[PDB]
Amino acid sequence: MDNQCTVQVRLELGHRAQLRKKPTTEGFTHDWMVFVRGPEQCDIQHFVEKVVFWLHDSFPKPRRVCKEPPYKVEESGYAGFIMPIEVHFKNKEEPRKVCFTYDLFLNLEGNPPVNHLNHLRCEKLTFNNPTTEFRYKLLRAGGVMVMP
Amino acid sequence: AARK
Secondary structure, X not given: OXXXXXXEEEEXXXXXXXXXXXXXXXXXXXXXXXXXXXXXXOOHHHOEEXXXXXXXXXXXXXXXXXXXXXXXXXXXXXXXXXXXXXXXXXXXXXXXXXXXXXXXXXXXXXXXOOOEEEEEEEEEEEEEOOOHHHHHHXXXXXXXXXXX | OOXX
């Protein structure tokens, strides 16, 4: 009715990868960066407490935490892998976070390997009847109150 | 290529 509120916010998850012309002493073959960012004219820091990137167990300190922008991780590696990415919200009630499963891929679907790639994934979050305090952070971050 |  007139009494309910729905707020929608958008996130982008992305990465780039480049094949090194010289493998490292460990045989790492690629340089890659994974990032989480808001869209044009959006500052996700107002409603995001932190972004956690869960790296594969082979990496040093695999849980990478970003408490302020830019939310990103830079690493050198030899294989693609699935990376949980958790976005923790500045909300005292549920939901406290949202979890994505991101494919950190170093080569495209086509069988031949490539020299470099990048990828962007868009995600829309919807919040129904969020708390007075959380609602403001969502909107202050470039969020959209859904008009009936 | 190689996945882990």
